[PDB]
Amino acid sequence: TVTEQGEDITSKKDRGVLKIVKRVGNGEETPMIGDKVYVHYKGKLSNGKKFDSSHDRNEPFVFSLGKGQVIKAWDIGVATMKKGEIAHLLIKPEYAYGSAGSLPKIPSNATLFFEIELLDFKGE
């Protein structure tokens, strides 16, 4: 395997959000922009210095899709997912926290990885 593997799910096709489906979900419907989306996730910097999981809070992470409450890669990535799907996303800084980063959690120009389980989604 190669680091730059996965489907490029960016609109610009700049290989900045790469996705692999690890467990197939069900239903033909992905979430629409506006949906209240429920996930579990495990995230990290690619450099292995920080890890973050919804499981650390013992509760699902909830957010509204496409409202930019999360990084751009999540709005793009979760919109491709089906209920019950677990996916992996490798994210260049342009679809995460950019050259500014988000100190102290995220350094400048950081690449991020997430495993995301799409638990459920309901329309606003």
Ligand SMILES: COc1cc2cc(OC)c1OCC/C=C/CCOC(=O)[C@@H]1CCCCN1C(=O)[C@H]2C1CCCCC1
């Ligand atoms: C930059 O701030 C964080 C980033 C992440 C988790 C956080 O709290 C648990 C963070 O601090 C408090 C909540 C802030 C959320 C910022 C928005 O976060 C995000 O958009 C994405 C997707 C939703 C899960 C959280 N997340 C993050 O970038 C985490 C990172 C934490 C560090 C390892 C890489 C993930």
